[PDB]
Amino acid sequence: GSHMNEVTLLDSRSVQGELGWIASPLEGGWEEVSIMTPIRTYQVCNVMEPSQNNWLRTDWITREGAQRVYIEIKFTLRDCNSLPGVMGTCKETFNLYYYESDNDKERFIRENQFVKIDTIAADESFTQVDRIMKLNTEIRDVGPLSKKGFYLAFQDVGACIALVSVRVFYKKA
């Protein structure tokens, strides 16, 4: 659980970990919201408008030599009960994807090239950082990986979510 036996591949909170994220649609879906020690978060909350399918993906992440990587997501959202008067299709989850690639400048990855890792929900585990934010923590892993690197993606289909941080690492031998 320390840096002595884990190699970080991506840390959204770090200097060069914030640049490279792409939102589809570019506007009206996932949007950056700084929160502050400033942190670049990505949020989406189109609970009134119908048929939402908003995507957010990272830049190319090398797996170095990892056969298996770990994805730790810290986030928070609003239950549909907390939002009276929303569409009957209000969601409380989102989807986590990945696409392996040897190329570092893919400019046309489609929904069907991305493979779903799991549905992410606000569950039992969380963390706590003038004030303190209480954020759900979820961790998922994928493997075996084979290509030089990979892309990560997040899909919103009508929820009110705030992605506070995303961390990608693997475990030393």
């Binding site: 919201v33 949020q43 909350c45 928070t76 609003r78 929303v86």
Partner: peptide, 11 residues
Amino acid sequence: XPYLVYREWSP
């Protein structure tokens, strides 16, 4: 057209 924004939540 975010209904709410988390900073707490606000419109």
